Amino acid sequence: PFIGTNINKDNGIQIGTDTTNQPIYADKTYQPEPQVGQTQWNSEVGAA
């Protein structure tokens, strides 16, 4: 259910970024949540 743009091998997928830009990744323990999905019914994203 979760979608993020970049994925590297160090921490998997990111979940956001800070202001002075750097990829703020996901914790292996409690991220990504099982419940985070889409608030829009459309836009099944893919290929980018």
Binding site: T39, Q40, W41, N42, S43
Partner: protein
């Protein structure tokens, strides 16, 4: 207003209309408005609401 299919755009298949309907909602407190800057009722997000 007049539409058609991409196979035959020469001859119109489907048509439709346009309406100045005074849309209101006396009973919706409108949870989940998505982000629009300031504009009209046009974004792919604002179509959900």
């Amino acid at each position: 207003q007049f539409f058609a299919l991409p196979s035959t755009p020469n001859e119109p298949k489907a048509v439709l209309y346009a309406e100045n309907v005074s849309i209101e909602a006396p009973d919706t407190h409108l949870v989940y408005k998505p982000d629009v800057a300031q504009g009209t009722i046009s974004s792919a997000d604002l179509l959900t609401q």
